[PDB]
Structure 1
Amino acid sequence: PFFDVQKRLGLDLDRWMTIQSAEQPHKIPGRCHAFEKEWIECAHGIGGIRAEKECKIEFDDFVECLLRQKTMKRLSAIKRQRDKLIKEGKYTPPPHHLGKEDPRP
């Protein structure tokens, strides 16, 4: 099956492109560089079976960075409550949330 010629010869045919935290041109970082770095350093050397249980926190954080599902849920709840509060009319959002702000540099 897998014949690891790259490991045996130290060739690096395709390993440069496997992860997004790996030596990008001009040191441009991925959106989730820190999360992937943390997850990889957590799961290194302990095997997949152990990593799936013991590095679940780091992987969940990495997935949250990748897809932002919880963030969208929270924002949707906030905007729904705001819409409910404004429809019956007891919120009156501040002037800087309507476009009447004084911008800073």
Structure 2
Amino acid sequence: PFFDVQKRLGLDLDRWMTIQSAEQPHKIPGRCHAFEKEWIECAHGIGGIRAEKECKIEFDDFVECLLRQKTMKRLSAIKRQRDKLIKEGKYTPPPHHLGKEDPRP
């Protein structure tokens, strides 16, 4: 079913391309390199069954970096509250958020 010829011969036929944290050209990093490094090191050698429970924190952080679902939710909440308080005139946006900032290098 899975004859691990690569591991028996030490070949690396396709393992160079399986993960995002593995030796990219010119050392260009993946967007989620640290999260994946952490999740891989947390779950290494403990087996699949233990890794899903005991490394769920690292994997949840990794998935958040990948898809950013909670970040978009928080931004949407903030902007809805801003829209609501602006419509009634309660809140006034600062100049550096309207296009009149003092830009810095």
| TM-score computed with the length of structure 2 as normaliser | 1.00
Partner in structure 2 of residue 47 of structure 1: 47
Shift of 1:76: 0.1
Q: SS state of the match for residue 20, structure 1?
A: coil
Shift of 1:12: 0.3
Describe the superposition over 1:50-100 as per-residue Cα deviations: whole angstroms up to 9, x where unpaired: 000000000000000000000000000000000000001111100000000
**Structure-1 separation of matches of 2:13 and 2:90:** 63
How many equivalent residue pairs? 105
**C-alpha distance in 2, partners of 1:88/1:35?**
42
- The whole-number CA distance in structure 1 between the counterparts of 2:30 and 2:50 is 27
* CA RMSD in angstroms, aligned pairs only: 0.2
Between the aligned partners of 2:101 and 2:90, the Cα distance in structure 1 is 21
- How far the C-alpha of 1:6 sits from its partner, in A, is 0.2
Q: Report the Cα distance in structure 1 between the residues aligned to 2:48 and 2:75, rounded to whole angstroms.
A: 34
Cα distance in structure 2, aligned partners of 1:21 and 1:61: 15
CA displacement at 1:14 relative to structure 2: 0.1
- Structure 2 distance, partners of 1:45, 1:92, is 55
Runs of 4+ in structure 1 off by over 2 angstroms are none
Deviations 1:24-57 (A, max 9, x none): 0000000000000000000000000000000000
**Gaps in structure 2 of 5+ consecutive residues:** none
| Runs of 5+ unmatched residues, structure 1 | none
Distance in 1 between the 2:74 and 2:101 partners?
25
Q: Distance in 2 between matches of 1:98 and 1:91?
A: 14
Give the % identical residues: 100
In 2, Cα distance between the equivalents of 1:53 and 1:92? 46
CA separation in 2, counterparts of 1:53 and 1:103? 47
